[PDB]
Amino acid sequence: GSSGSSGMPTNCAAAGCATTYNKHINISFHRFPLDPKRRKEWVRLVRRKNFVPGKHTFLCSKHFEASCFDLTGQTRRLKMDAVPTIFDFCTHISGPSSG
Ligand SMILES: [Zn+2]
Numbered sequence: 001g002s003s004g005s006s007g008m009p010t011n012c013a014a015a016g017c018a019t020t021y022n023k024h025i026n027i028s029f030h031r032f033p034l035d036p037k038r039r040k041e042w043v044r045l046v047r048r049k050n051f052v053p054g055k056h057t058f059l060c061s062k063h064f065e066a067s068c069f070d071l072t073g074q075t076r077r078l079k080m081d082a083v084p085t086i087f088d089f090c091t092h093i094s095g096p097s098s099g
Pocket of ligand 1: 012013014017018019059060063
């Protein structure tokens with residue numbers, strides 16, 4: 001953060017993740033997008049049932065390509081039009097989704 005304050009152990013919605021509150025972790029907590037296009041995506045990507053973002057729903061900046069943030073113009077704020085292009089949820093072993 002910048003001015004700190006309001007520090008709480010906000011778990012990560014992502015699956016197979018290990019983020020919460022280490023020490024040197026400078027990861028930023030970016031809740032879900034207020035947009036329907038992304039909102040559904042984040043949930044459809046996080047791979048966690050048909051759950052919905054209501055509270056404590058956030059994702060680490062590690063699952064995002066970063067470039068999807070608002071750095072182009074200083075700082076780095078997760079664009080409301082961004083989405084987790086990754087997640088490394090290891091579907092099964094290596095094969096695609098198919099199903
Ligand atoms: Zn995470």
